[PDB]
């Protein structure tokens, strides 16, 4: 990130979100549920929004 | 060794010494004006 700081402008953004997950196996974890944990609220956003 | 006594009824030597002083002053006014404005380019690019 620090190779791409905005150097001195002023900081105006977009944001773009990509979490890569919501991935069904026999095997789902922990690791799978801290992911599929954001993906669902995501989904509640495109509700909410 | 002819130099001062008589020979500055004339030119050349005349105004030098003078220029000295006052070219000093030309230089560095000239330098600011040229650093300046561009420092305040970098300037107003962070301030923003």
């Known amino acids: ?49 | 060794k002819l130099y001062i006594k008589v020979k500055p009824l004339l030119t050349m030597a005349k105004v030098e010494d003078e220029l000295k002083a006052l070219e000093e002053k030309l230089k560095k006014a000239l330098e600011s004006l040229e650093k300046e404005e561009k420092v305040r380019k970098d300037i107003e690019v962070q301030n923003v």
């Open chain 1, 1 to 49: 990130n620090e190779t791409l700081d905005t150097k001195q402008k002023r900081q105006y953004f977009i944001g773009v979100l990509d979490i890569a997950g919501f991935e069904i196996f026999d095997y789902n974890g922990f690791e799978q549920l801290c992911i599929n944990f954001t993906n669902e609220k995501l989904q509640q956003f495109f509700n909410h929004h």
